[PDB]
Design an enzyme around this catalytic site. Sequence first.
Site, PDB file in Angstrom:
ATOM      1  N   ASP A   1       0.980  -0.800   0.153  1.00  0.00           N
ATOM      2  CA  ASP A   1       0.326   0.352  -0.323  1.00  0.00           C
ATOM      3  C   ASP A   1       0.791   1.040  -0.004  1.00  0.00           C
ATOM      4  OD1 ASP A   1      -3.276   0.138   1.147  1.00  0.00           O
ATOM      5  OD2 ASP A   1      -2.134   2.317   0.610  1.00  0.00           O
TER       6      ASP A   1
ATOM      7  N   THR B   1     -19.841  -2.787   2.650  1.00  0.00           N
ATOM      8  CA  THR B   1     -20.557  -4.019   2.849  1.00  0.00           C
ATOM      9  C   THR B   1     -20.024  -5.438   1.942  1.00  0.00           C
ATOM     10  OG1 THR B   1     -23.101  -2.615   2.630  1.00  0.00           O
ATOM     11  CG2 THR B   1     -23.660  -4.737   2.064  1.00  0.00           C
TER      12      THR B   1
ATOM     13  N   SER C   1     -10.631   4.424   0.509  1.00  0.00           N
ATOM     14  CA  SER C   1     -12.247   4.899   0.922  1.00  0.00           C
ATOM     15  C   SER C   1     -12.263   4.111   2.710  1.00  0.00           C
ATOM     16  CB  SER C   1     -12.888   4.817  -0.154  1.00  0.00           C
ATOM     17  OG  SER C   1     -12.192   4.755  -1.575  1.00  0.00           O
TER      18      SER C   1
ATOM     19  N   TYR D   1     -28.540   8.301   3.636  1.00  0.00           N
ATOM     20  CA  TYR D   1     -28.952   7.333   4.910  1.00  0.00           C
ATOM     21  C   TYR D   1     -28.145   7.577   5.945  1.00  0.00           C
ATOM     22  CZ  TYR D   1     -23.608   6.823   3.220  1.00  0.00           C
ATOM     23  OH  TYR D   1     -22.318   6.770   2.627  1.00  0.00           O
TER      24      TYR D   1
ATOM     25  N   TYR E   1     -26.371 -28.456 -29.654  1.00  0.00           N
ATOM     26  CA  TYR E   1     -26.907 -27.444 -28.255  1.00  0.00           C
ATOM     27  C   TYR E   1     -25.522 -28.623 -27.498  1.00  0.00           C
ATOM     28  CZ  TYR E   1     -29.493 -25.656 -24.232  1.00  0.00           C
ATOM     29  OH  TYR E   1     -29.243 -24.828 -23.051  1.00  0.00           O
TER      30      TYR E   1
ATOM     31  N   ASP F   1     -24.465 -22.043 -21.846  1.00  0.00           N
ATOM     32  CA  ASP F   1     -25.385 -23.103 -22.784  1.00  0.00           C
ATOM     33  C   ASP F   1     -24.814 -22.473 -24.416  1.00  0.00           C
ATOM     34  OD1 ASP F   1     -27.037 -21.029 -22.368  1.00  0.00           O
ATOM     35  OD2 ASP F   1     -28.521 -22.764 -22.862  1.00  0.00           O
TER      36      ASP F   1
ATOM     37  N   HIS G   1     -11.922   6.434   5.913  1.00  0.00           N
ATOM     38  CA  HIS G   1     -13.452   7.566   5.549  1.00  0.00           C
ATOM     39  C   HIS G   1     -14.695   6.511   5.941  1.00  0.00           C
ATOM     40  CE1 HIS G   1     -13.552   8.031   0.979  1.00  0.00           C
ATOM     41  NE2 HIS G   1     -15.031   7.935   1.380  1.00  0.00           N
TER      42      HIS G   1
ATOM     43  N   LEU H   1     -30.447 -17.685 -40.167  1.00  0.00           N
ATOM     44  CA  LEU H   1     -30.156 -17.166 -41.427  1.00  0.00           C
ATOM     45  C   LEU H   1     -29.134 -16.598 -40.706  1.00  0.00           C
ATOM     46  CD1 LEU H   1     -33.425 -16.622 -43.235  1.00  0.00           C
ATOM     47  CD2 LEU H   1     -31.811 -18.398 -42.987  1.00  0.00           C
TER      48      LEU H   1
ATOM     49  N   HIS I   1     -18.642  12.224  -2.869  1.00  0.00           N
ATOM     50  CA  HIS I   1     -20.110  11.457  -2.539  1.00  0.00           C
ATOM     51  C   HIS I   1     -19.983  12.255  -0.625  1.00  0.00           C
ATOM     52  CE1 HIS I   1     -22.579   9.531   0.063  1.00  0.00           C
ATOM     53  NE2 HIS I   1     -22.458   8.239   0.376  1.00  0.00           N
TER      54      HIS I   1
HETATM   55  C1  LIG Z   1     -16.062   7.281   0.153  1.00  0.00           C
HETATM   56  C2  LIG Z   1     -17.344   6.714   1.325  1.00  0.00           C
HETATM   57  C3  LIG Z   1     -17.578   5.688   1.293  1.00  0.00           C
HETATM   58  C4  LIG Z   1     -18.502   4.998   1.627  1.00  0.00           C
HETATM   59  C5  LIG Z   1     -19.475   5.221   1.808  1.00  0.00           C
HETATM   60  C6  LIG Z   1     -19.024   6.745   2.502  1.00  0.00           C
HETATM   61  C7  LIG Z   1     -17.894   7.340   1.949  1.00  0.00           C
HETATM   62  C8  LIG Z   1     -18.161   9.229   1.865  1.00  0.00           C
HETATM   63  N1  LIG Z   1     -20.035   4.539   3.002  1.00  0.00           N
HETATM   64  C9  LIG Z   1     -20.030   3.340   2.881  1.00  0.00           C
HETATM   65  C10 LIG Z   1     -21.183   2.616   3.802  1.00  0.00           C
HETATM   66  O1  LIG Z   1     -21.926   2.853   4.054  1.00  0.00           O
HETATM   67  N2  LIG Z   1     -21.714   1.377   3.244  1.00  0.00           N
HETATM   68  C11 LIG Z   1     -20.621   0.378   2.197  1.00  0.00           C
HETATM   69  O2  LIG Z   1     -20.745  -0.377   2.382  1.00  0.00           O
HETATM   70  N3  LIG Z   1     -19.670   1.150   1.914  1.00  0.00           N
HETATM   71  C12 LIG Z   1     -19.190   2.672   1.763  1.00  0.00           C
HETATM   72  N4  LIG Z   1     -18.765   3.404   1.045  1.00  0.00           N
HETATM   73  C13 LIG Z   1     -17.543   2.573   0.018  1.00  0.00           C
HETATM   74  C14 LIG Z   1     -16.482   2.191   0.961  1.00  0.00           C
HETATM   75  O3  LIG Z   1     -15.329   3.465   1.542  1.00  0.00           O
HETATM   76  C15 LIG Z   1     -15.826   1.752  -0.350  1.00  0.00           C
HETATM   77  O4  LIG Z   1     -16.240   1.058  -0.974  1.00  0.00           O
HETATM   78  C16 LIG Z   1     -14.860   0.719  -0.090  1.00  0.00           C
HETATM   79  O5  LIG Z   1     -14.138   0.797   1.414  1.00  0.00           O
HETATM   80  C17 LIG Z   1     -13.605   0.131  -0.828  1.00  0.00           C
HETATM   81  O6  LIG Z   1     -12.837  -0.535  -0.393  1.00  0.00           O
HETATM   82  P1  LIG Z   1     -11.549  -1.121  -1.559  1.00  0.00           P
HETATM   83  O7  LIG Z   1     -10.055  -2.202   0.175  1.00  0.00           O
HETATM   84  O8  LIG Z   1     -11.694  -2.128  -2.252  1.00  0.00           O
HETATM   85  O9  LIG Z   1     -10.910   0.392  -1.546  1.00  0.00           O
HETATM   86  P2  LIG Z   1      -9.712   1.019  -0.999  1.00  0.00           P
HETATM   87  O10 LIG Z   1      -9.726   1.040   0.832  1.00  0.00           O
HETATM   88  O11 LIG Z   1      -9.994   2.292  -1.459  1.00  0.00           O
HETATM   89  O12 LIG Z   1      -7.846   0.444  -0.303  1.00  0.00           O
HETATM   90  C18 LIG Z   1      -6.761   0.331  -1.917  1.00  0.00           C
HETATM   91  C19 LIG Z   1      -5.677   1.013  -1.471  1.00  0.00           C
HETATM   92  O13 LIG Z   1      -5.933   0.905  -2.271  1.00  0.00           O
HETATM   93  C20 LIG Z   1      -3.948   1.531  -2.090  1.00  0.00           C
HETATM   94  N5  LIG Z   1      -3.093   1.868  -3.886  1.00  0.00           N
HETATM   95  C21 LIG Z   1      -3.931   2.522  -4.628  1.00  0.00           C
HETATM   96  N6  LIG Z   1      -3.027   2.422  -5.546  1.00  0.00           N
HETATM   97  C22 LIG Z   1      -1.878   1.686  -5.728  1.00  0.00           C
HETATM   98  C23 LIG Z   1      -1.162   1.902  -5.597  1.00  0.00           C
HETATM   99  N7  LIG Z   1      -0.300   2.051  -7.173  1.00  0.00           N
HETATM  100  N8  LIG Z   1       0.452   1.110  -4.680  1.00  0.00           N
HETATM  101  C24 LIG Z   1       0.250   1.071  -3.444  1.00  0.00           C
HETATM  102  N9  LIG Z   1      -1.052   1.014  -2.941  1.00  0.00           N
HETATM  103  C25 LIG Z   1      -1.587   1.402  -3.943  1.00  0.00           C
HETATM  104  C26 LIG Z   1      -4.450   2.791  -1.371  1.00  0.00           C
HETATM  105  O14 LIG Z   1      -3.429   3.467  -0.721  1.00  0.00           O
HETATM  106  C27 LIG Z   1      -5.546   1.675  -0.945  1.00  0.00           C
HETATM  107  O15 LIG Z   1      -4.959   2.129   0.475  1.00  0.00           O
HETATM  108  N1  LIG Z   2     -29.318 -19.885 -31.070  1.00  0.00           N
HETATM  109  C1  LIG Z   2     -30.317 -20.606 -29.933  1.00  0.00           C
HETATM  110  N2  LIG Z   2     -29.301 -21.120 -28.973  1.00  0.00           N
HETATM  111  C2  LIG Z   2     -29.723 -21.801 -27.987  1.00  0.00           C
HETATM  112  O1  LIG Z   2     -29.653 -21.895 -27.399  1.00  0.00           O
HETATM  113  C3  LIG Z   2     -30.897 -22.734 -28.260  1.00  0.00           C
HETATM  114  N3  LIG Z   2     -31.193 -22.961 -27.380  1.00  0.00           N
HETATM  115  C4  LIG Z   2     -32.810 -23.705 -27.480  1.00  0.00           C
HETATM  116  C5  LIG Z   2     -33.583 -25.159 -26.938  1.00  0.00           C
HETATM  117  N4  LIG Z   2     -32.459 -26.018 -26.549  1.00  0.00           N
HETATM  118  C6  LIG Z   2     -32.802 -27.410 -27.180  1.00  0.00           C
HETATM  119  C7  LIG Z   2     -31.126 -28.011 -27.358  1.00  0.00           C
HETATM  120  C8  LIG Z   2     -32.094 -29.223 -28.044  1.00  0.00           C
HETATM  121  C9  LIG Z   2     -32.704 -29.580 -28.498  1.00  0.00           C
HETATM  122  C10 LIG Z   2     -32.462 -30.576 -29.623  1.00  0.00           C
HETATM  123  O2  LIG Z   2     -34.075 -31.305 -30.102  1.00  0.00           O
HETATM  124  N5  LIG Z   2     -31.941 -31.222 -29.509  1.00  0.00           N
HETATM  125  C11 LIG Z   2     -32.128 -33.148 -29.985  1.00  0.00           C
HETATM  126  C12 LIG Z   2     -32.166 -32.687 -31.914  1.00  0.00           C
HETATM  127  C13 LIG Z   2     -30.327 -33.090 -31.836  1.00  0.00           C
HETATM  128  C14 LIG Z   2     -29.832 -33.597 -33.404  1.00  0.00           C
HETATM  129  O3  LIG Z   2     -31.453 -34.608 -34.096  1.00  0.00           O
HETATM  130  O4  LIG Z   2     -28.837 -33.814 -33.814  1.00  0.00           O
HETATM  131  C15 LIG Z   2     -31.370 -33.789 -29.385  1.00  0.00           C
HETATM  132  O5  LIG Z   2     -32.324 -35.606 -29.147  1.00  0.00           O
HETATM  133  O6  LIG Z   2     -30.531 -33.924 -28.423  1.00  0.00           O
HETATM  134  C16 LIG Z   2     -33.887 -28.005 -28.892  1.00  0.00           C
HETATM  135  C17 LIG Z   2     -33.755 -27.548 -28.442  1.00  0.00           C
HETATM  136  C18 LIG Z   2     -33.467 -23.693 -29.008  1.00  0.00           C
HETATM  137  N6  LIG Z   2     -32.654 -23.065 -29.878  1.00  0.00           N
HETATM  138  C19 LIG Z   2     -31.613 -22.347 -29.851  1.00  0.00           C
HETATM  139  N7  LIG Z   2     -30.996 -21.219 -30.289  1.00  0.00           N
END
Ligand SMILES: *Cc1cc2c(cc1C)nc1c(=O)[nH]c(=O)nc-1n2C[C@H](O)[C@H](O)[C@H](O)COP(=O)(O)OP(=O)(O)OC[C@H]1O[C@@H](n2cnc3c(N)ncnc32)[C@H](O)[C@@H]1O
Ligand SMILES: Nc1nc(=O)c2nc(CNc3ccc(C(=O)N[C@@H](CCC(=O)O)C(=O)O)cc3)cnc2[nH]1
Lengths: 104, 828, 312
Positions: free
Chosen positions: B33, B361, B43, B257, B537, B550, B46, B657, B223
């Site tokens: 850090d 959170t 963040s 809040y 499929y 899928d 604070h 098509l 904020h």
């Molecule tokens: C600002 C704010 C945020 C906030 C909030 C109210 C305010 C005014 N209220 C919240 C709330 O009540 N409930 C909630 O869930 N979140 C709330 N937030 C948001 C929250 O503070 C942030 O989303 C969260 O703290 C983010 O955490 P994260 O761990 O992701 O980030 P960070 O604390 O900013 O830490 C990042 C660290 O990275 C280090 N850093 C960045 N660049 C470098 C480089 N180049 N080298 C080394 N270290 C680096 C930073 O220094 C930092 O400590």
């Molecule tokens: N673009 C597209 N993507 C999909 O994901 C998709 N999925 C369905 C729903 N899933 C399917 C999956 C299998 C068969 C099916 O009849 N398979 C048969 C035929 C295989 C074959 O005759 O070669 C089987 O026996 O497994 C039909 C619909 C329909 N159209 C789609 N169309």
Amino acid sequence: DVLHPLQPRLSPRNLRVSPFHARHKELGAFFLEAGGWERPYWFEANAALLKEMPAEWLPPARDAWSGMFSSPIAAAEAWKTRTAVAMYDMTPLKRLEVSGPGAL
Amino acid sequence: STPRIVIIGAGIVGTNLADELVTRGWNNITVLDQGPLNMPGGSTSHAPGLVFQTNPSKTMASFAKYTVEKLLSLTEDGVSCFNQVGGLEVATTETRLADLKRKLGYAAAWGIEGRLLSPAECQELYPLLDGENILGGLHVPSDGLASAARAVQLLIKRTESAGVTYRGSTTVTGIEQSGGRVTGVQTADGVIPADIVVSCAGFWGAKIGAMIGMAVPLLPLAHQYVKTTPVPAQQGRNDQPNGARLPILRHQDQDLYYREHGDRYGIGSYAHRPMPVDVDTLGAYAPETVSEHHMPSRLDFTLEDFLPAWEATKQLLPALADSEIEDGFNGIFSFTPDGGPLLGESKELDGFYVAEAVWVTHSAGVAKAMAELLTTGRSETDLGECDITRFEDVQLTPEYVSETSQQNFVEIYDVLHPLQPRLSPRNLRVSPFHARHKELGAFFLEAGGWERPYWFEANAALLKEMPAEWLPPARDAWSGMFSSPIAAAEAWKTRTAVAMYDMTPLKRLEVSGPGALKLLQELTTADLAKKPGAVTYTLLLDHAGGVRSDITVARLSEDTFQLGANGNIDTAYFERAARHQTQSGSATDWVQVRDTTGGTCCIGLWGPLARDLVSKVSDDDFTNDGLKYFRAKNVVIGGIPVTAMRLSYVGELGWELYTSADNGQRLWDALWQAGQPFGVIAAGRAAFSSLRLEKGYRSWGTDMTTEHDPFEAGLGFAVKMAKESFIGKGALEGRTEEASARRLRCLTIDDGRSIVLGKEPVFYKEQAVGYVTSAAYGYTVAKPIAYSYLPGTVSVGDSVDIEYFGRRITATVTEDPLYDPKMTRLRG
Amino acid sequence: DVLHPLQPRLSPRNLRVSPFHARHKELGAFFLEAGGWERPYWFEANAALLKEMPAEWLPPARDAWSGMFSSPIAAAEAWKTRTAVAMYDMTPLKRLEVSGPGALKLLQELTTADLAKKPGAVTYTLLLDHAGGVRSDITVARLSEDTFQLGANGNIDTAYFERAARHQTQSGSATDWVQVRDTTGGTCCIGLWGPLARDLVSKVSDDDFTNDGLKYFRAKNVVIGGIPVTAMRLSYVGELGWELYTSADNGQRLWDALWQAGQPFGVIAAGRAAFSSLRLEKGYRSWGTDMTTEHDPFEAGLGFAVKMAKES
Ligand SMILES: *Cc1cc2c(cc1C)nc1c(=O)[nH]c(=O)nc-1n2C[C@H](O)[C@H](O)[C@H](O)COP(=O)(O)OP(=O)(O)OC[C@H]1O[C@@H](n2cnc3c(N)ncnc32)[C@H](O)[C@@H]1O
Ligand SMILES: Nc1nc(=O)c2nc(CNc3ccc(C(=O)N[C@@H](CCC(=O)O)C(=O)O)cc3)cnc2[nH]1
Ligand SMILES: Nc1nc(=O)c2nc(CNc3ccc(C(=O)N[C@@H](CCC(=O)O)C(=O)O)cc3)cnc2[nH]1
Ligand code: NA
């Protein structure tokens, strides 16, 4: 059936369209219909503006009911009408020509 | 006999990972850090530590349950690292109140005890709440507060005792490699040798990834978190300075809040603009200078961004109006494009792994899964949503990561439907049919960057002519989101006429070379040594017999196979396996793997009139004699060379098509025109998903994961146990579908109308015994369908209840397929 | 029948189209076909520019014969390529991927260039026959240690490489195998050329397209409008800019991003008639007419492309 006040029919539709219809479709119009006319409620093209819109224009979340036939895109469309320039399709506004020596 | 391991980062993830490796017998670990070991300064240093276990993700919920268990166990001087105060999420809107009923379902599905509370019960549990606002709450007694910094210290202590080395004040500057594998970690003082390097560098994860040319799709974002002055109403109630007695408190309707800190309140706010952070501007902190209020993760507080949150807070908790803001900071953490963490082995470098973008959170759970992965080759928990290789290439660009991660922050606490799309960026990847789909009014949703029609507005005109037996009941507002009755018409026409589905986004891999057959013979469960033209499929298993995927395999020639797969986890798995076979093999063992999805396209042409249609635009023989079921051949349709494969995910006559992207629009237009007298339609994913469910065709990642073997999943038919060798064969010896303790079952909903969506818990004789994997309304069978694993003792014909928004829906275990079990539509 | 050399068939048409086809139709593309590909010769959208074009660019009247399958719109397209910025559809340029541990060895023997250069180098080079006749002029871009992307002249080239690759593989070691794939139909290319090309691209990418960022006749991976692209700095029309390659599924997005970025710069779509005129103004040779296997490189004026110091 329980239906929202803006629920459209799905048919018949596209009976009456304004001259801008192809351009509206290019822009992703969401159309609803009244009196046979297809009317854009917003345009999907404008969704790209939401990310650039000032936060003051972004509305709160809607509930499921008020959210039906609504989109946050409408906020962007209002934004651009208030700050830039917008083109609304007023074609469906009832238009009457009253003419002759007795018109006045 | 143990690999040399370097962990980068002594946060809650890196230290838990060292610990989980040690208990599994791997202790040749060096944890590095750049910060001082006593307070690293990422963040974790604070974090307030709120831990809410309930989550829509089964995997994330399991990680959280493990973190609770582990932190309770991690103790010194009689004090653990978890204060189990419980957790309460409150609702102030009707939308939120309904969503809490859904979350109660997640709780039961994932084995977490909780209860819905009335407004009165919320008052009793949490009297500081002004009740006028409160419509209800979700209470989970096992939630609570982590002591994350203390945990790091105790984890360092016990892993050091077991032989792990820690080097604080040590900055990683590069990663040494040779022959495509990691060989060491570079610092200012030389190289530390390593066979395995795990990057647990939190929000520095992208900077570390660049050291090996790996794209790590997290964005550092800030904020706000605030501590009040002492709150008068709280005087004398908790242990100073940092005790807590009330459940941790979520107020998701206002993006807030809360926890107690002695008699003060801690307030976390997402109620502000996204705040991207450039890690290269943080400055190198001299380790001697790192302290509680001076560490890389804490940026200056911007009071103006917090004022609306402060007002909302005083409205929820009026006692706080008699306190002031004492201290705030803008604290850096990580977000990703889909909100999942980033785990697993890199594509670029063997032995180099990530465990990044992890909430406190989930920290111990991620560490346990990674320790399992490193020491056995697999995680005991499904990592499909966590694996770094899940992303498509367009999802790995800095621009995509920045945009989507910011939007995930903006929406962090929003109630969202499972099919809710992003509005930007969109239209990144489109099939060759895109203009024709827009002409037809496609409603598109997106996955992996691909725009996919769910239905077509052109087909709304068919509803009036559809037989009444096909028209479904009304849907509720929730199941009706991102759904349309048009899907019923599309299913109708697929079952009675002919339809064109866009199968272009189905992951498509070409596996080629003199070693291609050998590679596929070892990785799959089928005997693939069949003359070219065979389609099979088959499954990819791990060494424990769990189902990795899928797939369909079509042998196109002696040394060329085309695979239909499930995503980029499959692509990366084949790429590495191919490279390893090539490197260690002879002149006749080389094999290349290409992801050809984006260069090609596919129309699924399905329905009882498919032969009538295709016959108009081809002189090739598409009778049963000309192309048998599950065979492939080259044909010409509308002038275009096509590879035709006879199978159907929707259960009808017809073919996939395939052709090159440049030919796709012509193929589309030729079939379209030919299909006019037969009533051909374009058909979208909503109908497709319903029809495939009616066939009982499994969907990898929901209906089965690596947590299931083929027999539990009902896919025994796809495993050729007589094969000499294949991955997973030894694990599956003696196993059968009939003797499986858990089996995937088809459920039909008795009332014909109550649609479920996925993840709802399933009860047998009032006990939670499964959860919905896949679900849809079945238009042919005219009822909702749901799949669930169930204990083997539950039989076809038995009744179960599925809980949907707190209401129990009766369902019957039913034989599958629901439609055409004698395959009359598919055969001959 | 008496037929003009550019006379197209009326059917079958629209067999092969690039990812930009809908956008080209919006712009009124006049398409002619070759190898099955629909290729714009000019765009009717650009007729509106003729009235604003400086008179020095307006050509004289053509006769009925030279005027067939020609339009004055091509003059406007050339004008904008020389003074602004234009997007050409290079998708139909034959595109071959040559890969494997024997790829460099194969290309070292078949071409007239020393290709043992670090990845990122683009080289214009010749394929000769044993008599020194010119089989083809190609571009070779080394994308990685074992992957090369070739721009070639057609399917005679594809077949020539396929057989040569197979023969090397069959007679070679474990480290001599090489595969050849014709990737044209799965990918696409925009030639983004003109003096405002850097101004345009800078709006939709954060990669460095200055001279320091991408030198002449080099290639690098970039992101434009969210799309991963292989950018090669060369120009068949003789202006600043790049060939921008990507997978077919990404093409329309790449097109739309550049299009939108280009609006304040007066970007146009430009077709094959202007392209052919501009490349002639550069003296760039077209294989099959300006040279065939009947000509050696020196007769063709392509001596610069033959490295006589190569061992073999
Ligand atoms: C600002 C704010 C945020 C906030 C909030 C109210 C305010 C005014 N209220 C919240 C709330 O009540 N409930 C909630 O869930 N979140 C709330 N937030 C948001 C929250 O503070 C942030 O989303 C969260 O703290 C983010 O955490 P994260 O761990 O992701 O980030 P960070 O604390 O900013 O830490 C990042 C660290 O990275 C280090 N850093 C960045 N660049 C470098 C480089 N180049 N080298 C080394 N270290 C680096 C930073 O220094 C930092 O400590
Ligand atoms: N673009 C597209 N993507 C999909 O994901 C998709 N999925 C369905 C729903 N899933 C399917 C999956 C299998 C068969 C099916 O009849 N398979 C048969 C035929 C295989 C074959 O005759 O070669 C089987 O026996 O497994 C039909 C619909 C329909 N159209 C789609 N169309
Ligand atoms: N796709 C494509 N194919 C071509 O055949 C092609 N040919 C030309 C015309 N020929 C060429 C050939 C060489 C150089 C050239 O300047 N070669 C220099 C630069 C090499 C370098 O700096 O690495 C030389 O010094 O040989 C320019 C145009 C231009 N664009 C093309 N673009
Ligand atoms: Na928010």
